[PDB]
Amino acid sequence: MRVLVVPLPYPTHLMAMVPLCWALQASGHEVLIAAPPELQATAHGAGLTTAGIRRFPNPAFGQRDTEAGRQLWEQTASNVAQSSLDQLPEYLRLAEAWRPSVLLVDVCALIGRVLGGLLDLPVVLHRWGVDPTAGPFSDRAHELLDPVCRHHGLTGLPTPELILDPCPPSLQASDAPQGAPVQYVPYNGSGAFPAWGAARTSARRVCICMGRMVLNATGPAPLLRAVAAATELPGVEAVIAVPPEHRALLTDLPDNARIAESVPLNLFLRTCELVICAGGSGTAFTATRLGIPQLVLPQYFDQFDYARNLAAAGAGICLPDEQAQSDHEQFTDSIATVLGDTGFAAAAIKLSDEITAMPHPAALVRTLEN
């Protein structure tokens, strides 16, 4: 196979596919990443090769039955459809040059389904996490991209061959069509094993990690409310994982607090009792895979679903909206509840077990073959 990988221009979506890209390559197949500038460093930082392509929190994301919730998801499909069309010439040329035989495509990167349709190539969708694109998004996607595909002789945007799904079924949106399961492998970037990452401490270790993309969109509030909530509680040791660009957000920290700057989470998370995060699937799924419960402050897109379904399975707590997130008493009480009740860790382990019972990226390569 020559597998051309087409993600939306968000690091997490491409990182979700990185262990499968590596399984494909360790299996003999070729792999190229269609990468806009926002994905270049991510792609290369995983040892992969590329072709160059040129308000919060908002709970309505998690409410597709609302007027506002329907509108947000349609608006996303509309923006993506538009730029898919803008970019189709470029992607056609790339496919001419490199001649892929399969397209491995982000569920949200519609460009990929059009390309599959137009070039008659089989299309393998890949979910990055909780997938809430049924209904509003997917309907709007057909209504906008149906025409171009019919112009080329198809009935419409086609249904994909296969949809790979790293999300444990238990957490998956209830209306997401059946995918083919694949075990989540926590790829969190390259980096260094920290000395203190080897064992827990007598302290209650709490990791805060909001990721780059979230805070650029939200401003510092969710990180800084998390730091305020965690360090207040007696006996907690805060581990704060930030990219270099957000290190200066952190001014006055207690003495036992640790700044972990660009340190892959999976390297130390097992020494932690709690993750405070925003529901971004790279931090969140690495925690759940390592059986660590979470306190989730969702902001946008699929984060509210993930936080809801996580809490429903008992493996964490959601702060659902601006009223909850801005309330230091609820924030701190939520941390104290998780630390004081080992039923959270127990639920989280149960989910870790759901994940590790799933076929690994290695096993999926044969599915892709067929």
Ligand X SMILES: Cc1cn([C@H]2C[C@H](O)[C@@H](COP(=O)(O)OP(=O)(O)O)O2)c(=O)[nH]c1=O
Window 13-52: residues binding a second copy (CB under 8 A): 18-20, 22-23, 25-28, 30, 32, 43-52
Instruction: Report in angstroms how near the CB of residue 78 gets to ligand X at its nearest.
Output: 22
Residue 231 or 299: the one with the smaller Cβ distance to ligand GLC is 299
Tell me, by CB under 8 A, how many residues bind a second copy.
42
Separation between Cα atoms, residue 124 and residue 104, nearest integer Å:
5
Tell me how many residues contact ligand GLC (CB under 6 A).
9
E-assigned strands of 319-370?
Answer: none
Of 48, 47, 50, 46, nearest to 37 by C-alpha is 50
Residue closer to a second copy (CB basis): 145 or 272 = 272
User: Which residue reads 């969109």 in tokens?
Assistant: 217
Helix (H) / strand (E) element for 339: namely helix 328-339
The dihedral region occupied by 191, where left means phi > 0, alpha psi between -120 and 50, and beta the remainder, is: left
Nearest distance from C-beta of residue 197 to ligand X, angstroms: 12
What torsion do the CA atoms of 241, 303, 127, 169 make, to the nearest 10 degrees?
110
Site for a second copy in 250-289 (CB under 8 A): 264, 266-267
Taking CB atoms, the residue at the shortest distance from Mg ion is 228
Taking the least distance from each CB to ligand X, the nearer of 149 and 305 is 305
| Cis status, amide bond into 57, omega within 30 of 0 | yes
Three-state helix/strand/coil letters over 204-242? EEEEEECCHHHHHHHCCHHHHHHHHHHHHCCCEEEEEEE
Q: What are the two backbone dihedrals, phi and then psi, of residue 89, each rounded to the nearest 5 degrees?
A: -50, -55
To the nearest whole angstrom, how small is the minimum distance from the Cβ of residue 178 to Mg ion? 8
Query: Taking the complex as a whole, how short is the minimal distance between the CB of residue 261 and ligand X, in angstroms?
Result: 6
When CB distances are held under 5 to 8 angstroms depending on the partner's kind, the choice from ligand X, ligand GLC, a second copy, none that residue 362 binds is a second copy
**Does 200 engage in binding with a second copy (CB under 8 A)?**
no
> x-or-dash pattern for Mg ion, window 162-201, by CB under 5 A?
----------x-----------------------------
| Piece of 52-60, 183-191, 223-231, 241-249 that binds Mg ion (CB under 5 A) | 223-231
Quickly tell me which residue has 């360090």 as its tokens: 231
CA 87, CA 267: separation in Å to the nearest integer? 38
Which residues in 276-313 are b (16+ Cβ under 10 Å) and which e?
bbbbbbbbbbbbbbbbbbbbbbbbbbbbbbbbbbbbeb
Given the structure tokens 């269609």, which residue do they identify? 34
Q: Which of 95, 119, 102 is nearest to 17 (CA)?
A: 102
Nearer to ligand X by C-beta: 52 or 343?
52
Compute the distance between CA of residue 308 and CA of residue 286 in angstroms, rounded to an integer.
Answer: 18
CB of 368 to Mg ion, least distance (A): 23
Nearest residue (CB) to ligand GLC, 65 versus 329:
65
Does 12 appear as a known binding residue?
Answer: yes
Q: Which residue is nearest to ligand X (CB)?
A: 211
User: Which residues fall in the annotated binding site?
Assistant: 12, 188, 211, 214, 263, 265, 282-283
Which residues line the annotated binding site for dTDP? 12, 188, 211, 214, 263, 265, 282-283
Name the residues that contact Mg ion, by CB under 5 A.
Answer: 172, 228
Q: Which residues of the chain form contacts with ligand GLC (CB under 6 A)?
A: 62-65, 69, 132, 173-174, 305
List of residues contacting a second copy (CB under 8 A): 18-20, 22-23, 25-28, 30, 32, 43-52, 97-98, 183, 185, 187, 189-193, 195, 198, 264, 266-267, 356, 360-363, 365
